[PDB]
DNA sequence: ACAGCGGTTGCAGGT
DNA sequence: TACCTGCAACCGCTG
């Protein structure tokens, strides 16, 4: 018959390096038998208005919550998956559980800002102590903004100068095994259903299981650490890691693929940073930022900082960084790009892997992002943002929007002369086109001399490869060698228009 | 002041 | 091999 401490999961679905969670566990064990602990995850049915979520990411979260519960079970506790909106949920669970303190990890995203504010205001009303922690990113965006005179650095090299003169926080371990902690007595919901706050099953979470692809990347903290240690095994590979040197179209990932685990917070970026630093010190010949592996982690930190200031970071209108470009509507060309039926086998192969597996390589994301926007189709990056938002396992509001602005040359990147060739780009790393053959099996019998460009081969040859254009594989919707030059001139025109105002 | 430099990852043609 | 200059040219940051 006592008060309750609460940790609230949103991002940071881990035990390791969770100062918000450890602060609960250390305090509860400081006064044993005086508290109840409720590690909660609010299954908010309001994020659906905020973001598109595909089947693949729902599977990831299902596996994450299942692992988080298993990890919490070993600490004499458990997870509580509460259904309903926080604005409705909190008032009830504050009184019924009798909550004294509530902790959670901070998030810059607009949905959280309005949510975290409304929660903390109500906490002040109900006499609930709230102390938040900043552990999703290595550096606090506000402090970076502050030390750069109340504004965010709009270049990478300037950003590096601001962050290097800041203290790197202590990476924490796993919280203590709860001493003298019985199961909290069943509330109004738990009495009416014992399994009310249990982990949502696949059926409960994934509404359309036919959209699910192969489960190549299982969710959870356990897999995150496991995959990290596997990636850090070859220290030679880690040290000399240079991003442009990595292939976009290799069958098995040329990079670590820790981004989904960093997005959900199954892996601590601080720990990953700390682990990388240690290897660097044991390796003489090592790569330096931005191309380095730590540099890649710094890019995450970079996009998180600029987005912290601008709430309209995901849209063109009202965005302080985004170049105002008259993008054209074309639902026909949009539907084709979204489902990988453009007629460009390299672009289609990437988009099909994105739909099926839920992850694609950085330079593979580059090729498609350029093609849709300033490259060929001249379609707004906001459209491709939603496609990525739905299909990506690592869908990060800040990272998704920022990198889309990079490739559309709306912000940060400005050299619109550098346009990716959907025909040539893939050839360098994959001359045979194995990647195309796997994800576009229609063209698997085509020779390497015209697999990136089927329109080059005669009809009599098309029949001989068991794939005729127009039926078995769509005609190329636009002509790259023509459209990209016209788009270059369009980019220069809009670059003047924005320059005029300033 | 305007002007040189650097900018995660262009392409084609060349050595 | 890994880097050579054309292409006609952007932005922010620097002194
Ligand atoms: C149009 C577009 C949209 C993108 N959307 C997302 C997204 O929503 N979420 C996301 O995590 N990444 C996004 N990326 C960035 C990048 O493609 C991925 O982070 C990377 O390919 C994931 O593979 P990895 O984990 O092996 O990265 P690694 O090469 O292993 O890099 C290490 C870590 O650094 C981070 N990182 C790498 N590249 C970037 C970068 N370009 N910007 C910011 N952080 C980076 C990732 O979290 C990654 O886990 C996007 C890129 C483009 C071009
Ligand atoms: O608080 C929650 N946040 C959820 N978010 C997590 C989200 O990243 C954080 O809540 C952010 O802090 C919101 O801006 C999700 C994100 C996804 O990409 C996919 C599914 C979810 C589900 C939830 C959820 O149920 N509850």
Q: What is the resolution of this structure in A?
A: 3.2
How far apart, in whole angstroms, are the C-alpha atoms of residue A40 and residue A83? 10
How far apart, in whole angstroms, are the C-alpha atoms of residue A338 and residue A333? 9
Give the position, in ligand 2's atom list, of the atom nearest the Cα of A110.
14
Q: Residue A499 carries which DSSP code?
A: H
| Phi, psi for A176 (deg, rounded to 5) | -70, 150
Nearest protein CA to atom 18 of ligand 2, as residue:
A395
**Exp. method:** X-ray
Give one DSSP letter per residue of A27-96, joined into a string. HHHHSTTSEEEEEEEEE-TTHHHH----HHHHHHHHHHHHHHHHHHHTTT---EEEES-HHHHHHHHHHH
Counting Cα atoms < 13 Å in the Cβ hemisphere of A226 gives 7
Q: Which residues contact A482 (CB under 8 A, 6 or more apart)?
A: none
Counting Cα atoms < 13 Å in the Cβ hemisphere of A113 gives 9
How far apart, in whole angstroms, are the C-alpha atoms of residue A148 and residue A168? 17
Please name which of A191, A205, A186 lies closest in space to residue A83, comparing C-alpha atoms.
A205
A396 within ligand 1 shell (Cβ under 6 A): yes
Strand C bases contacted by the protein (CB, 7 Å): 7-14
Task: Report the distance from CA of residue A238 to the C1' of nucleotide C15 in Å, as an integer.
Answer: 38
| Phi, psi for A128 (deg, rounded to 5) | -120, 120
C-beta separation of A24 from A37 below 8 A: yes
Domains and CATH numbers, chain A: 1-135 (3.40.50.620), 136-171+221-310 (1.25.40.80), 311-496 (1.10.579.10)
Question: Any bridge partners for residue A133, and if so which?
Answer: A105
Q: Which residues contact A130 (CB under 8 A, 6 or more apart)?
A: A101, A102, A103, A119, A120, A123
């Amino acid at each position: 018959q006592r008060s309750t401490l609460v940790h609230w999961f949103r991002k940071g679905l881990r035990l390791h390096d969770n100062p918000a969670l450890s602060h609960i566990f250390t305090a509860a064990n400081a006064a044993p038998g005086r508290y109840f602990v409720r590690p909660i995850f609010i299954l908010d049915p309001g994020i659906l208005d905020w973001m598109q979520v595909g089947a693949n990411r729902w599977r990831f979260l299902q596996q994450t919550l299942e692992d988080l519960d298993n990890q919490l079970r070993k600490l004499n506790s458990r997870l509580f998956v509460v259904r309903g909106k926080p604005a409705e949920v909190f008032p009830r669970i504050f009184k019924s559980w009798r909550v004294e303190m509530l902790t959670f990890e901070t998030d810059i995203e607009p949905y959280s800002v309005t949510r975290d504010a409304a929660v903390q205001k109500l906490a002040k009303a109900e006499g609930v102590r709230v102390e938040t922690h900043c552990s999703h990113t290595i550096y606090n965006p506000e402090l970076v903004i502050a030390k750069n005179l109340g504004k965010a650095p709009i270049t990478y090299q300037k950003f590096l100068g601001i962050v290097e003169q800041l203290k790197v926080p202590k990476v924490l371990g796993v919280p203590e095994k709860l001493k003298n902690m019985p199961t909290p007595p069943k509330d109004e919901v738990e009495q009416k259903d014992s399994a009310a706050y249990d982990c949502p099953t696949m059926k409960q979470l994934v509404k359309r299981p036919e959209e699910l692809g192969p489960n190549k990347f299982p969710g959870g903290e356990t897999e995150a650490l496991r995959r990290m240690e596997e990636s850090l095994k070859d220290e030679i590979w880690v040290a000399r890691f240079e991003k442009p040197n990595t292939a976009p179209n290799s069958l098995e990932p040329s990079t670590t693929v820790l981004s989904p685990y960093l997005k959900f917070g199954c892996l601590s970026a601080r720990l990953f940073n700390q682990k990388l630093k240690e290897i660097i010190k044991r390796q003489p010949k090592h790569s330096q930022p931005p191309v380095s592996l730590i540099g890649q982690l710094m890019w995450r930190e970079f996009y998180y900082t600029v987005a912290a200031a601008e709430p309209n970071f995901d849209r063109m209108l009202g965005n302080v960084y985004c170049m105002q470009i008259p993008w054209q509507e074309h639902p026909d060309h949009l539907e084709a790009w979204t489902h990988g039926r453009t007629g460009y086998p390299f672009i289609d192969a990437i988009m099909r892997q994105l739909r099926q597996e839920g992850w694609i390589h950085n330079l593979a994301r580059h090729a498609v992002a350029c093609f849709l926007t300033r490259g060929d189709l001249w379609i707004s990056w906001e459209e491709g943002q939603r496609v990525f938002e739905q299909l990506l396992l690592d869908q990060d509001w800040a990272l998704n929007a920022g990198n889309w602005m990079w490739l559309s040359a709306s912000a940060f990147f400005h050299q619109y002369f550098r346009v990716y060739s959907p025909v040539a780009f893939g050839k360098k790393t994959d001359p045979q086109g194995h990647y195309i053959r796997k994800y576009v099996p229609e063209l698997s019998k085509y020779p390497a001399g015209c697999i990136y460009e089927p329109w080059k081969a005669s009809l009599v040859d098309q029949r001989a490869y068991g794939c005729v254009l127009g039926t078995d594989y769509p005609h190329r919707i636009v002509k790259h060698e023509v459209v990209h030059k016209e788009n270059i001139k369009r980019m220069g025109a809009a670059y003047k228009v924005n320059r005029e105002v300033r």
